[PDB]
Amino acid sequence: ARIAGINIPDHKHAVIALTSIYGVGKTRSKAILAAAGIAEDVKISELSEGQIDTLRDEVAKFVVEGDLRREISMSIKRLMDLGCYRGLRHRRGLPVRGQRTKTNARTRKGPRKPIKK
Amino acid sequence: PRSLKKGPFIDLHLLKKVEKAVESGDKKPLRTWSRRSTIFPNMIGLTIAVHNGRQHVPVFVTDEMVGHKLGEFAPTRTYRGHAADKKAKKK
Amino acid sequence: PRRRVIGQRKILPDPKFGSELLAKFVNILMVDGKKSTAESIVYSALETLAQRSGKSELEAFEVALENVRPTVEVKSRRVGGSTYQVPVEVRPVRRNALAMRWIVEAARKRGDKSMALRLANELSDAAENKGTAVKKREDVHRMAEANKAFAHYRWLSLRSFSHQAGASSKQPALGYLN
Amino acid sequence: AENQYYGTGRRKSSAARVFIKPGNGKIVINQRSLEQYFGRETARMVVRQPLELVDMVEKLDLYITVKGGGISGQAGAIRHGITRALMEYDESLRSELRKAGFVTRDARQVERKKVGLRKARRRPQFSKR
Amino acid sequence: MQNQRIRIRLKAFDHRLIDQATAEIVETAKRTGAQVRGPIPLPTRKERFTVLISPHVNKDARDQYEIRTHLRLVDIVEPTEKTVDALMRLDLAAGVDVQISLG
Amino acid sequence: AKQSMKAREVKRVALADKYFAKRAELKAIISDVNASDEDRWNAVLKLQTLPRDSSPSRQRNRCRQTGRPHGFLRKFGLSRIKVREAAMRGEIPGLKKASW
Amino acid sequence: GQKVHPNGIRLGIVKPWNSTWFANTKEFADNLDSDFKVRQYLTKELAKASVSRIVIERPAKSIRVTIHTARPGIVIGKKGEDVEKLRKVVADIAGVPAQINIAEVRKPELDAKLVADSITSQLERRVMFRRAMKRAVQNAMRLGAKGIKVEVSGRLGGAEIARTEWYREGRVPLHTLRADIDYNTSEAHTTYGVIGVKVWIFKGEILGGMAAVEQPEKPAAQPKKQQRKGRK
RNA sequence: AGAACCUUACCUGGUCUUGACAUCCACGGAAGUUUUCAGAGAUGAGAAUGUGCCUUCGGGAACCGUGAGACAGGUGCUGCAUGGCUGUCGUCAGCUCGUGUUGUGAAAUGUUGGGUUAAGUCCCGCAACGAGCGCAACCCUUAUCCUUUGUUGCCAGCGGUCCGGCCGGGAACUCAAAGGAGACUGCCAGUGAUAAACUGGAGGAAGGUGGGGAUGACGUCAAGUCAUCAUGGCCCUUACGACCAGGGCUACACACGUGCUACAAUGGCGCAUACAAAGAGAAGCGACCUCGCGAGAGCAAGCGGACCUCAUAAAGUGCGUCGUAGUCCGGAUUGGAGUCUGCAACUCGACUCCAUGAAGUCGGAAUCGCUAGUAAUCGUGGAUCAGAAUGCCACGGUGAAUACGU
């Protein structure tokens, strides 16, 4: 059952169900389901809470978001004392790795403003 | 995010200039045009002055700076801000 | 414009049917271009109507497709004087296609658990004259039935026609004299 | 046709080769069963659909070859290849099935893309000032 | 699956040029050997170019150029190399090249 | 247009032969995966400093008969403008206008 | 002044061209530059006489030049040395053993580019260009062709401003796509600057060029109608 | 049309002036190849292989450096100084060439009306007559269907046989590329002024000049390119040339053109399941190989692409599932690892993959394309192409509403 994330369903298959319960996407969710002996073809809503508890427990070893987003805090913080320009753009959210920024940009580079066409 | 070609190297062009300088314990600005280069153990403790296409800008090379190509520390370009115009009068 | 009148083309049948009323129902149910799903969307809907009553599978479908369906339409024309309208009688083919279009827009936003439930309930709802396009059929036919009292630029057309051979009555016209 | 009467069934750039005879009722497709070639697909219920009409799911025997197209277009093509072939009860059989719609081929031909566009015919839009 | 005895390809740039050049190779192949195979048509190749119709501007119409590359089999039932030497030599018409090989 | 990029390309093919030939896979042999426990050390990582201009990665060509600012076409040795120009006069062989 | 693309988008669809050779793959570029070079350098060598069409051709193992003239044997020289020299340079540029034959076109004593030579002289000498284009078309229609179009441009008559003018006669279709029809663009300078004539000439709508082949190549000239085909 | 420098205009730094390139004279090194090194690289030094080419062995070409003229070179200006070239109206349904006539003539008439059309097509008719252009045509292509080839294509019966044309073998069959056949608004009926022709009607693979494409007049617009290219007047020619490195267009504040894929459920997911067409590969790609999370990697049989490989083609199909909740849609950013062409991927480049996770609920003013293989939508290949695609270009999957009326 849904509890966590943005793509956990209610009464759909197991493959997807571990993928926003933090620390596990598709690749691990395949290996986890097998390890408890659970099918890659049951809907998770049909199980006891104690099979969800066994699955959850095998997710919980891998990096959850709380510690990921601290790594990204220390990442920006280290980079900005360098002045490594790639790193200055990563902080602000500026598509730098191989991308254009003159696009439809608002969510990253800021909202609508009074300037000539 | 981007690994620096498949097997190990050092950058041959920066190696011959740096190697002779790290022996002398130089920290003086090393006049460099060769900006397609990486940072390595042999390069720590140096100050590599990096032509930008107008003049050289000094980059102090240190242990914290591994995982990068030279030239990004010092300006690659200027930014675009949020308030400017060229248009005016003056007599 | 147009140098000639041009009619409809031949439309091909689909791998699950040989009846036309079925094939034309799957067709304007088509989105993303993929009819081979729409085949099922029509037959899964029709079984749900058929469980609601067993006399037919067609119970709610046949009168929804009459009741949300127009008969007449009004265009607006004026090149001088005052503002006027000209009603026209239109083809069954477009009467039908407004009605089916409006059934499939209304049912897909109806928000029930299967597209089968959504369509059987939205035909069940318009069949009884209390669904969502009963209002749209009633307003559009009222306006076309009413503007039959007007004609393109009437005030100069009433002198212009009787000078160049024509009638002394009051009649609707296709952007010309009356 | 000097061994079996034959239908060609070319529709939508797929062609159903269909060799008909009297028999025990069965179908062979692609030197196999309907279950091998069209296993777990709606296409199997289509290919019986002309044989149910002429009541020949049990006494017409058939040999079937199909290449070109995709999943619906081959199913559609075999539906034309059977009714094409069916001449060998009456010389009017293939005339009448066409009159009923099963040899009737759709009004679609090849057409080539044109240049200066974004699609076959679909010019770019303008919204400039 | 009946295989071939020898491997031959005739290569040309348009549809008149392949028919005449082939018709002449097939004539040489009878005139210098007994045992001859008529030509299979093979899937002809088509190259797509788009260029601009004008030196600068416009977008509405542009230009598309085609070049076809035509393939004939010919071959010969007899595998006799002397016939293929003669075949490729005496083909000097309509600017087709025939490519020879053994096997 | 403009001769300096055409001038660069003409010098480049003799300079490809001179610098790059002896130093093609040498990058890979001395540094990358071919250097499997052999090389990878400083006393051999100074050997490739001549080739940089000679490299295939700067061998852009453009229009092989005049020069042109981008929009080159590799199958003709020609460009957009110059292809159309040669076709008007019938100089190009096998050339259809598309219709099928 | 829209100037519809007057011949390029009209070829190879039963309309012959001034090259006939086969290439494909990535080496088509090496064969075309070589074909431009041999077109440029060879006609300059036989420039002693006027010349009406040029055809260069590459079949299996050879290079064959066809050239068309207002009189035959004239670019071929005397003895045979003159023509062995023409074959020396055709091999040298293409890099294959060389052939040349002499042939003439339909209506040989008339051609697109000899009209533009006639119109250019008056302009080169800065006198008598107001009836010259018209007399060129008159002579041209007395020597052959079923229709002719002439368009002249320049700082014409030596003027201190530009002029477009043209002259058209008879039957010259412009959406035509069957039979070769002969075209030349002159470019030249004199004291005041550049002049030019665009000369379209029209011989025939099925006369001249190739015709569409009237058979498959598949049944003809085949002494044995099988390899096996299951019939043995 | 594939932009790290190169590209390439731009900008800065080195460096030289017959100069990247031709010929002609002068000097040092052969070019080519292997190989260590300095400097940024240009460039140079040293090692080792070679001293070829022609000849007065004067001397020079080839590549590279050096130098001098003649001369090469010039995205040099000027597009009211120009040539070549092309966009518009528009598929407007008209325009023009020769010539007569009516008026003193400018100029018309035709080239304009009615009805009909892709049509100067066709009935009627006035000063227009004769002819060309647009349009019709030849044209390539498709559609069944005839027709031939019979592999690198196919398989009704038959063999080897796991039942795969892989191969003994077979020609009923698609099937590929080509001769083409068939369909002409020809017929019948309605409509239409008698009438062109439109619509209906029918057999048939197929009817609206069968389906597709080709296909666009004279020409004003001082329209746009001197920057493909041509070129004078006319300027530099230690340079408005040229060798070398690095930086930037692709910044980011946003607005704007175009297109892509989402916002759903006609869809996504999970598991199970299916069929292509076409084409590209001679410095190349490429089975097997060993390595690889996957992309790919180096080696290589092989290849010339209906033979070998890109390629598991995807959407779609089967079942179950989902309820407007940013979800069961979407998956940007970012941490972090793995890859490509090349000393060298940081800003400017491309692809693979692991974890987390936002914008976006069909968008206002504005606004276009489309009549059916279209429109819509999903994958594919190709042009381009050092390296790589969301586009374009072409293909194939699944494939629609309607065309009253101006």
Encode A38-67 in three state secondary structure.
Answer: CCCCCEHHHCCHHHHHHHHHHHCCCCCHHH
Q: Which nucleotide C1' is nearest D104 CA?
A: H205
* Distance from C-alpha of E35 to C-alpha of B75, rounded to nearest angstrom: 78
Cβ distance C39 to C16 under 8 Å?
yes
Q: Residues D98-103: contacts with CB within 8 Å, 24+ apart?
A: D101/C13, D101/C18, D102/D50, D102/D53
Residues composing chain B? 91
Tell me the three state secondary structure of residue F15.
helix
Residue of C9, C12, C20, C34 to mutate when probing chain D, most D C-beta within 10 A: C12
State whether G55 and G134 are in the same domain: no
Are F75 and G29 a contacting pair at CB < 8 A? yes
What values do phi and psi take at G183, rounded to 5? -130, 140
Q: Encoding tokens for residue E88? A: 């490729």
How many angstroms separate the Cα of A64 from the Cα of each of A33, E23, G187? 19, 75, 75
Are E60 and D114 a contacting pair at CB < 8 A? no
Nearest CA in chain B to A116: B85
Protein-to-nucleotide distance from the CA of A3 to the C1' of H121, whole angstroms:
76
Residue B76 domain flag: yes
Are D123 and E60 a contacting pair at CB < 8 A? yes
Are A82 and B75 a contacting pair at CB < 8 A? no
* Distance from C-alpha of B33 to C-alpha of B55, rounded to nearest angstrom: 10
Instruction: Write the CB contacts of F83 (distance below 8 Å, at least 6 apart in sequence).
Output: E49, E51, E65, F73, F76, F92
Beta strands B56-60 and C72-77 are unpaired
Instruction: Residue E17: count other Cβ atoms within 10 Å of its Cβ.
Output: 26
Are F93 and E65 a contacting pair at CB < 8 A? no
Residue nearest to nucleotide H174 (CA to C1'): D17
Cβ distance C177 to C166 under 8 Å?
yes
How many angstroms separate the Cα of E4 from the Cα of each of C154, E10, E73, E75, E83? 85, 16, 10, 8, 16
* Distance from C-alpha of G13 to C-alpha of G179, rounded to nearest angstrom: 9
Instruction: Write the CB contacts of C112 (distance below 8 Å, at least 6 apart in sequence).
Output: C118, C121
Which structural domain, as residue segments, surrounds residue G138? 107-206
Residue G232 domain flag: no
**CATH code at position C32:** 1.10.455.10
Tell me the three state secondary structure of residue A110.
coil
Nucleotides of H under 7 A from a protein CB: 1-9, 11-13, 20-21, 31-44, 63-64, 73-76, 81-89, 96-97, 116-119, 131-145, 147-157, 163-180, 197-200, 203-208, 210-225, 227-233, 241-260, 264-283, 297-299, 304-307, 313-318, 320-324, 326-351, 353-360, 365-377, 381-387, 391-406
* Distance from C-alpha of A39 to C-alpha of A13, rounded to nearest angstrom: 10
* Distance from C-alpha of G167 to C-alpha of G165, rounded to nearest angstrom: 7
Beta strands G98-103 and F95-96 are unpaired
Tell me the three state secondary structure of residue G67.
strand
Residues of D in contact with E60 (CB under 8 A): 116, 123-124
Torsion of CA A30, A35, A38, A41, to 10 degrees: 20
Of G88, G82, G81, G152, nearest in space to G123 by CA: G152
* Distance from C-alpha of C110 to C-alpha of D117, rounded to nearest angstrom: 39
* Distance from C-alpha of F31 to C-alpha of C138, rounded to nearest angstrom: 81
- CA C9, C15, C18, C23 torsion-angle sign: negative
How big is the E-F interface in CB pairs under 8 Å?
39
Residue G10 domain flag: no
* Distance from C-alpha of E29 to C-alpha of G227, rounded to nearest angstrom: 14
Residues of F in contact with E66 (CB under 8 A): 95-98
Q: Give the single-character DSSP code of C123.
A: H
Protein-to-nucleotide distance from the CA of E7 to the C1' of H287, whole angstroms:
21
Cβ distance G125 to G136 under 8 Å?
no
Residues of D in contact with E59 (CB under 8 A): 116, 124
What values do phi and psi take at C127, rounded to 5? -60, -35
Nearest CA in chain D to E61: D116
Q: Encoding tokens for residue D40? A: 């777990």
* Distance from C-alpha of G208 to C-alpha of G105, rounded to nearest angstrom: 8
Cβ distance G87 to G100 under 8 Å?
yes
Computed on alpha carbons and rounded to an integer, the radius of gyration of chain A in Å comes to 20
Tell me the three state secondary structure of residue C112.
coil
Cβ distance F77 to F65 under 8 Å?
yes
Of E59, E61, E70, E63, nearest in space to E97 by CA: E70
DSSP states along F45-72: TTS--S-SSSSGGG-----TTT--SS-E
The region that residue F61 occupies, defined by phi over 0 for left and psi between -120 and 50 for alpha, beta otherwise, is: left
Nearest CA in chain F to D112: F100
Tell me the three state secondary structure of residue G81.
helix
Instruction: Residue A72: count other Cβ atoms within 10 Å of its Cβ.
Output: 12
Protein-to-nucleotide distance from the CA of F46 to the C1' of H238, whole angstroms:
36
Tell me the shortest Cα–Cα distance from E46 to chain D, in angstroms.
13
Q: Encoding tokens for residue C40? A: 């099922």
DSSP states along G147-187: EEEEEEEESGGG-SS---EEEEEE---SS--SS--EEEE--
Helices (H), B1-91: 12-22
Question: Which amino acid appears at position B61 of this protein?
Answer: V
The region that residue G179 occupies, defined by phi over 0 for left and psi between -120 and 50 for alpha, beta otherwise, is: left
Which structural domain, as residue segments, surrounds residue C132? 20-143
* Distance from C-alpha of A52 to C-alpha of G34, rounded to nearest angstrom: 74
Q: Which residues 22-61 of C have a C-beta within 8 angstroms of D?
A: 36
Reduced DSSP (H G I as helix, E B as strand, rest coil) percent helix, strand, coil of chain C, to 5: 50, 5, 40
Nearest CA in chain F to E69: F94
Are G26 and F75 a contacting pair at CB < 8 A? yes
Are F75 and G19 a contacting pair at CB < 8 A? no
Of G13, G87, G94, nearest in space to G59 by CA: G94
Instruction: Write the CB contacts of D75 (distance below 8 Å, at least 6 apart in sequence).
Output: C15, D42, D43, D46, D47
F83 touches chain E (CB under 8 A): yes
How big is the F-G interface in CB pairs under 8 Å?
74
* Distance from C-alpha of G153 to C-alpha of G194, rounded to nearest angstrom: 9
Rounded to 5°, angle at Cα G185 from G180 and G187: 160
Cβ distance F56 to F16 under 8 Å?
yes
Q: Encoding tokens for residue C115? A: 């597209």
Torsion of CA F58, F59, F62, F65, to 10 degrees: 140
* Distance from C-alpha of A78 to C-alpha of D87, rounded to nearest angstrom: 83
Beta bridge partners of D16: D66
Among F74, F84, F97, beta carbon nearest to G10: F97
Protein-to-nucleotide distance from the CA of G161 to the C1' of H80, whole angstroms:
8
Instruction: Residue C46: count other Cβ atoms within 10 Å of its Cβ.
Output: 20
Protein-to-nucleotide distance from the CA of D66 to the C1' of H397, whole angstroms:
16
Are D115 and E62 a contacting pair at CB < 8 A? yes
F99 touches chain D (CB under 8 A): yes
Are E65 and F96 a contacting pair at CB < 8 A? yes
Rounded to 5°, angle at Cα C32 from C27 and C33: 45
What values do phi and psi take at C84, rounded to 5? -140, 165
Tell me the three state secondary structure of residue B84.
coil
Q: Encoding tokens for residue C171? A: 């009649």
β-sheet with D5-7: strand ranges across: D5-7, D15-22, D60-67, D27-29
Tell me the shortest Cα–Cα distance from E103 to chain G, in angstroms.
16
* Distance from C-alpha of F66 to C-alpha of F86, rounded to nearest angstrom: 13
Q: Encoding tokens for residue G227? A: 């390899």
* Distance from C-alpha of F37 to C-alpha of F40, rounded to nearest angstrom: 8
Helices (H), chain A: 14-17, 26-36, 49-59, 65-80, 85-92, 106-109
The yes or no reply on domain E5-103 and CATH 1.10.3720.10 is: no
Q: Which nucleotide C1' is nearest B12 CA?
A: H343
Beta strands F95-96 and G19-21 are unpaired
Among A82, A97, A113, beta carbon nearest to B1: A97
Protein-to-nucleotide distance from the CA of D97 to the C1' of H306, whole angstroms:
36
How many angstroms separate the Cα of G152 from the Cα of each of D53, F44, F68, G170, G172? 75, 70, 29, 18, 17
What is the CA G76 to chain-centroid distance, rounded? Answer: 19
Residue nearest to nucleotide H245 (CA to C1'): B33
Protein-to-nucleotide distance from the CA of B80 to the C1' of H308, whole angstroms:
54
* Distance from C-alpha of D126 to C-alpha of F57, rounded to nearest angstrom: 39
Instruction: Write the CB contacts of A117 (distance below 8 Å, at least 6 apart in sequence).
Output: none
- Work out how many domains chain B is built from and give that number: 1
Q: Encoding tokens for residue G27? A: 């080496």
State whether G93 and G146 are in the same domain: no
Q: Encoding tokens for residue G1? A: 């002044």
Protein-to-nucleotide distance from the CA of E101 to the C1' of H301, whole angstroms:
18
How many angstroms separate the Cα of G167 from the Cα of each of D114, G151, G162? 34, 6, 17
- CA D60, D61, D65, D70 torsion-angle sign: positive
Of C70, C95, C75, nearest in space to C147 by CA: C75
Instruction: Write the CB contacts of C123 (distance below 8 Å, at least 6 apart in sequence).
Output: C45, C49, C60, C61, C64, C65, C103
Residue G225 domain flag: no
Tell me the shortest Cα–Cα distance from G212 to chain E, in angstroms.
7
Helices (H), chain G: 28-45, 81-94, 112-124, 132-143
State whether G174 and G186 are in the same domain: yes
Tell me the three state secondary structure of residue D79.
helix
* Distance from C-alpha of B29 to C-alpha of E98, rounded to nearest angstrom: 67
- Determine the straight-line distance between the first and last CA of chain D, rounded to whole angstroms: 67
Cβ distance C108 to C83 under 8 Å?
no
Protein-to-nucleotide distance from the CA of B67 to the C1' of H321, whole angstroms:
47
D80 touches chain C (CB under 8 A): no
Residues of D in contact with F100 (CB under 8 A): 110, 112
Torsion of CA B41, B44, B45, B46, to 10 degrees: 120
Instruction: Residue E52: count other Cβ atoms within 10 Å of its Cβ.
Output: 20
Method: cryo-EM
* E and G in touch (3+ CB pairs within 8 angstroms): yes
Residue B38 domain flag: yes
In our burial notation (b when 16+ CB lie closer than 10 A, e otherwise), range G92-103 reads: ebbeeebbbeee
Instruction: Write the CB contacts of C171 (distance below 8 Å, at least 6 apart in sequence).
Output: C151, C178
Are C9 and D107 a contacting pair at CB < 8 A? yes
